[PDB]
Amino acid sequence: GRKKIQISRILDQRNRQVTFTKRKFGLMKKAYELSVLCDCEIALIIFNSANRLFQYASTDMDRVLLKYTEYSEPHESRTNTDILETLKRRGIG
Amino acid sequence: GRKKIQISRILDQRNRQVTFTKRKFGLMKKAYELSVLCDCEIALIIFNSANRLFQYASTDMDRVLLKYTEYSEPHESRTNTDILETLKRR
């Protein structure tokens, strides 16, 4: 964008909702590309601040979640903390 | 990248696996930013071609999926077909 934004809660309600709508599509778009390019199955679940539910599934949500119940544990599990640290880490060298 | 790639299965196994690893992080990174910037809760579930499970949750996966089971239906549901159409037109 015209200016680099820090990663912290957007204060302005109008701008927060606009960024939400466009970044949400951007994320689904990238999920779609990832599923086709690398032949994987993807599900995305998003709850906004008002607890409204937005979802995306490369194939069918029912299909992806049913399959998830079949696994005892993931091969890889990440959270914001993990991503933040990986980013903080690369910041040095 | 140096060249624009079409969105279709990557034929070369080595390149497919490399693109997978980096785009997967790219997707999680963007999910993280979206959760912080707009104060939302996000869960991501990915099964690769070998059926291996990779996941991400802004808070706690257990928390997000439990909450999901409480909804009778989503406010918005999208699939590859829907995204493809949105891209084709406009």
Binding site: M61, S72 | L65, Y68, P74
Partner: peptide, 26 residues
């Protein structure tokens, strides 16, 4: 899934797996 809703059977299995601590989500 019509509107994207998952069946009750799937839904209940997810909840059980998670609650009974037998899910990858734990």
């Amino acid at each position: 899934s019509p509107k994207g809703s998952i069946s009750e059977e799937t839904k209940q299995k997810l909840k059980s797996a998670i609650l009974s601590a037998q899910s990858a989500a734990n």
